[PDB]
Amino acid sequence: KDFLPLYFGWFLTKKSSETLRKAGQVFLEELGNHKAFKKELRHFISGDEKLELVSYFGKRPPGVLHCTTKFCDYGKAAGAEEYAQQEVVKRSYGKAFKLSISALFVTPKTAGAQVVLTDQELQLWPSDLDKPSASEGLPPGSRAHVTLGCAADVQPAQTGLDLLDILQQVKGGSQGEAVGELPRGKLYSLGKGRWMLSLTKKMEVKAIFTGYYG
Template identity: 55%
Template sequence: QNRGFSKKSHAFLPKIFRKMSSQSAKERPEGLQYPFLDDDDTIATVKESKTFFILRGLPGSGKSTLAQAIQDRYKDACRVISVDTYKIVPAIRSTIPEEYSKVDEDLVECFKRDISVIVLDDTHHERERLDQLFDIADKYRYKIIFAEPKTQWRIDCLQLKEKNQWKLSVEELKKMKPSLEKDFLPMYFAWFLSKRSSEILRKTGQVFLDELGSLKAFKKESKYFAPAIEDPKIKIDLTSYFVKRPPGVLHCTTKYADFGKAAGAEEYAQHEVRTRGQGSWQRRRQGLTSSSPNKTALVQPCTIQHHPRQRGLRGSRAHIPLGCASGVEAVQTGLDLLEFVKLEKAGNKGEDVGELGAGKLQYFNNGMWMLVLSKKIDVRAIFSGYYGKGKLVPTQSTNKRGSAFSSCTII
């Protein structure tokens, strides 16, 4: 599998950055028209998030000009790190220069300060170097956004020879060019919620679990809760069961790509992401119709559409995992949501149990619970990809009852 980078198939290159404020766009040169520079909703979303811009391109293609434009737009909320200042000459090489260790030290310092927008200006033509950056960004929970200059000469090595400050020859530039044209896809594509939106949604789920754990009807339903039934003052601690995930952004997966190896990943990147992702930097309103935890997870169904891997309606697995039971992978939560979808398609709307603070509680038998929100929750989200190694988030449950909740499904 070819796992490099391509402006032909990569989901986050300027080619899809089309929807923007026309008035702001006219104020900029054509080569600097991006939604993250011109669209107010997009800019507000980026400011609410922890966003790591990785600028890529040949020397002299206009990366530094783009970096400066981002700096001017986000001002104090942004920090630009240019590898040029570290005197690292771009070239094809067998190993990553040790000088990058200083770059990474400064980069990590920015990450630790939770700066909203961090821009790294370099050619980024080496896969090994990108892997290093993916690891750092993953550790500090920053969303990665790739961007390339849109200058007319960005791939013209004859013009770049005259423009690059390193006085690289046409032959040297041509050697780097193929590595910037290889396909590279993330582990998965997703809508990543802003930091603030993630906090709001987590709090909503927390309140729901607290209310549900105190509800008499809920405690009566399960044979595992006999002690709690005898004493109505005892609250079932659902929070310790649906383990809190480490702080970070919530997301709704749209396509599992497995770095290009998953079936349909290339087609998705070239077609679905481009045709539906034109506003991918825009503020995203998600009409959340219900909130749910189940035997594997607390999840939030949403209106984002994607290709389900299981049978069902298009987008029927679109959801945002809020937490998982100990030892359970978040990827399983979509399967649980489909159980509710199948019941609803069959005409089972559930039994109304009562009103909670956020909406109406319904019971679907077999330990399946759903909260239908009285109001939709609007969140801000950015379409991007996850490029980390995909290690499972460790869960450390304080629940001592083992499988006591094994037959309880909550959505």
């Protein structure tokens, strides 16, 4: 009788969202104007001057930003029911957390921010079994992220997949030397239109763990 949320996750406060939102926009402009990116557009899009990444990532989160833990679809998603049953979930419901943003990334499909979860937060991370083939050798929670924008033709949960793809390269020493220096950190060109800004100082955001029902 009692149905679950659309998904659980950490929803940022109004200011943490505004700060992170603004930060993401600066990156999409700094990256768009960087000559290292403009000479690589052939790997990003298949058409043609300069591209404005902000407009490119037109499908943005309208309200407050968030970090999804477990997509439930009101209980239809596999493992949704077992996740909500967890004591840590019910105990943590409505409680405040601080999330650490380590990097900002961009791909032909998505623009997001990498979240590094603490051990207590990892307790709220789902350990469902029907895994991806992208999480091999990566620690659980690596997928943790905040979506800042999607291209027009992109599916949801793509931002999470893109991140894992990026981190798989970093693990394989395939990230390469930095191709630039932005005021917030070092810029990286990972090829295939993938980019990463490793923040000098990790950005902390306040958030509330809860459920979205839409």
